[model samples]
Target: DYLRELYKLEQQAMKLYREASEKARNPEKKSVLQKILEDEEKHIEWLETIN
Candidate 1:
């Protein structure tokens, strides 16, 4: 169930990054958060593709 746990962690990270990006007041902060979200998305995709 390690993959499942990893998926859940990635999901949580994605949500956190999304919220951080949305609530970010500064452009730099928003960009950083957006990047984090993108990275999380890639992680999720990688996990899904791993079989």
Candidate 2:
């Protein structure tokens, strides 16, 4: 049950990061956002696989 909440949280964060990355004008900032988005995706995958 709690994991579901965490999953939702991560998904939301991923969405924010994705949109941020798209909107970011700075190349370095965009790259960092992309990395964060990828990490969030990995976290979501881990959460799903764990339970």
Candidate 3:
């Protein structure tokens, strides 16, 4: 259940970060959102790799 929740949270975060990145008017803000999205993607990858 925890793993599923973790995955869901990561998915939500990824979506939010993507939207934020797309909507951001400032380059710096967009970059920050992109970084957050990248981090969330890494988290999802790490979760998937775990046995």
- The digit string of per-residue lDDT tens for model 1 on 5-36 reads 99999999999999989999999999999998
lDDT (Cα, tens digit) per residue for candidate 3, span 11-44: 9999899999999999999999999899999999
RMSD of each: 0.7, 0.7, 0.6
Instruction: Report the lDDT tens digits of candidate 2 across residue range 1-51.
Output: 798899999999999999999999999999999999999999999998973
Residue 8 in model 1: shift from native, Å? 0.4
TM-score of each predicted structure versus truth? 0.93, 0.93, 0.93
Write out the backbone clash pairs for model 1: none
Q: How big is the positional error of residue 15 in model 1, measured in Å on the Cα after superposition?
A: 0.7
Instruction: Work out candidate 1's RMSD over C-alphas.
Output: 0.7
The superposed Cα distance between candidate 2 and the true structure at residue 21, in angstroms, equals: 0.3
